[PDB]
Design a protein around this ligand. Structure first.
Ligand SMILES: CC(=O)N[C@H]1[C@H](Oc2ccc([N+](=O)[O-])cc2)O[C@H](CO)[C@@H](O[C@@H]2O[C@H](CO)[C@@H](O)[C@H](O)[C@H]2NC(C)=O)[C@@H]1O
Length: 513
């Protein structure tokens, strides 16, 4: 498709993908590129940097403050007061000033903007963080953290219990706990009252407490997380930790009876001799409809409809897509419809995998459910493609260099036979080196380099009181941490559906090296 034809489609990730393909092949002229940011659904990452090699963006500085941006650190004392305060939003600008001018400006702003006064006078010391911490200036603290992660200091009980009220807190807590940085910040966050935190923050503070073997504080944080989490899946994760720490059998019972299917509820069910959860059986009698499952633009449009449909319209759409050809769309609608409460684990295009052994079938299906929900023309915000969500680079390496498919194009990843074939091929490479389906999942999503580096550490997936569960909470990329948990559940389930059951307890035993 030419640019003129793309311009006629609605804005979507598929349209972006195809504009991106033109850009990377140098087929977009400077003239085509004029009206073009208005044609881009999500102007972020590679499509933006590529478009900006043809047409840089001047923007942006707001017309009201333009004069403020004609001053430098050497002339900021000649700027009016508004201009001074605007430029002092930047800590780099503050760091750049000389100390005499930080004193002058600190006094200028003492009454009206003591937040600026504190940062100015902080930067006249050899440790701005320590100055800010002594004032208990909370906004100042997060501005400094964002300017530099390298500041690290012990924080008293009063100060740390103020940090959770700021929007920055959640990312701050997660970042330092998962990356094992800022040891003094980390230790200090043991004294946060569980009453002052909730949800993810409370959960991460529970993980923090375990790293210091404060099992009682950890319980209290996880319990607060369990009570406040919005998602049943996250709640189950929190209850699991409550159980593992204190072993109250009401916690395990509550976890075993969860309506969310996840590794924690699965494991609880196995520990209590509770039956495997019920899996819906979708078998439409109708064989096809009008819909093109190979048209990525048609998927973008129907997906927008489904995500915007009221309860009543989802019923109309469920009926229309209740065919064998559109089974992945049927199941997507039903999963959307029933409030994430019935369990849908379909096996589409099964002919292409029925010859692999059943364990391999289940790993493939497990990956595809998380990657795409089996939508053949699925496209990610990073333009990973098809049911198995291959990055174009790897798709081209396998397709052209390794398998020498004649006239290979990366869009072949939109074909189920290709998606499953390449997925099998890549999963053999990963599994040969990693063994565990959990490790394979991490490597599939985040790369084998990152996975090998995690497994080479002394403190990850080794022996320990709370292993391997603790390690699974400390996987350094969030996306991959979540992905692995999800794919592993899927794997258990599909192994069960294929009459190739395994106990999730055996999977967990094999994670400890
Ligand atoms: C919270 C959660 O798990 N969300 C997932 C979502 O889950 C549901 C979807 C619909 C319904 N529904 O209809 O109710 C219910 C749940 O499915 C997406 C696939 O469609 C997953 O996207 C994929 O994420 C991968 C990393 O995990 C990434 O490698 C893939 O490139 C990416 N694929 C796409 C097309 O961008 C989401 O993460």
């Amino acid at each position: 498709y030419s640019i003129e034809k793309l311009k006629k489609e609605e804005n979507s990730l598929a349209k972006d993908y195809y504009i991106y393909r033109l850009l990377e092949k140098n087929k977009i002229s400077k003239k085509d590129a004029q009206d073009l940011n208005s044609h881009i659904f999500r102007y972020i990452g590679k499509i933006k940097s590529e478009l900006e090699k043809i047409i840089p963006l001047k923007p942006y500085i707001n017309p009201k403050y333009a004069k403020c941006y004609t001053y430098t650190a050497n002339t900021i004392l000649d700027a009016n007061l508004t201009c001074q305060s605007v430029r002092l939003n930047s800590l780099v600008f503050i760091a750049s000033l000389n100390s005499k001018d930080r004193t002058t400006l600190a006094q200028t702003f003492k009454n009206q903007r003591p937040d600026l006064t504190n940062l100015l006078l902080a930067f006249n010391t050899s440790d701005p963080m320590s100055y800010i911490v002594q004032k208990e200036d909370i906004n100042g603290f997060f501005k400094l953290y964002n300017y530099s992660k390298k500041y690290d200091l012990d924080l008293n009980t009063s100060l740390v219990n103020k940090l959770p009220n700021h929007i920055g807190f959640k990312d701050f807590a997660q970042n330092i706990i998962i990356k094992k940085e800022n040891p003094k910040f980390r230790h200090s966050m043991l004294e946060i009252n569980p009453e002052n935190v909730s949800e993810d923050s409370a959960f991460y503070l529970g993980v923090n407490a375990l790293t210091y073997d404060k099992t009682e504080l950890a319980y209290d944080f996880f319990k607060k997380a369990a009570q406040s989490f919005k998602s049943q899946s996250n709640k189950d994760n929190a209850i699991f930790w409550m159980w593992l720490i204190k072993n109250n059998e009401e916690d395990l019972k509550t976890l075993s009876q969860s309506s969310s299917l996840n590794i924690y509820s699965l494991y609880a069910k196995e520990l209590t001799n509770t039956p495997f959860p019920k899996i819906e059986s979708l078998n439409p009698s109708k064989k096809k409809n009008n819909f093109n499952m190979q048209d990525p633009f048609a998927w973008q449009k129907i997906n927008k409809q489904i995500r915007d449909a009221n309860a009543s319209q989802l019923d109309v759409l469920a009926k229309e897509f209740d065919t064998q050809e559109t089974l992945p769309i049927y199941a997507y609608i039903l999963e959307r419809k029933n409030n994430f409460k019935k369990h849908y684990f379909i096996m589409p295009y099964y002919d292409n995998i029925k010859d692999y052994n059943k364990t391999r079938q289940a790993l493939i299906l497990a990956i595809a459910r998380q990657e795409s929900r089996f939508i053949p023309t699925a496209i990610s915000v990073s333009y990973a493609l098809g049911m198995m969500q291959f990055m174009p680079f790897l798709a081209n390496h396998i397709g052209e260099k390794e398998l020498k498919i004649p006239n290979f194009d990366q869009d072949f990843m939109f074909k189920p036979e290709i998606a499953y074939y390449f997925g099998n091929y890549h999963l053999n490479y990963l599994e040969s080196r990693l063994k565990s389906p959990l490790f394979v999942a991490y490597a599939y999503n985040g790369g084998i380099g990152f996975t090998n580096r995690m497994l080479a550490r002394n403190d990850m997936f080794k022996t320990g009181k709370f292993e391997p569960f603790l390690s699974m909470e400390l996987v350094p990329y969030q996306e991959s941490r979540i992905y692995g948990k999800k794919v592993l559940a899927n794997y258990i389930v599909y192994r069960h559906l294929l009459n190739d059951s395994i106990k999730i307890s055996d999977i967990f035993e094999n994670l400890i090296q």
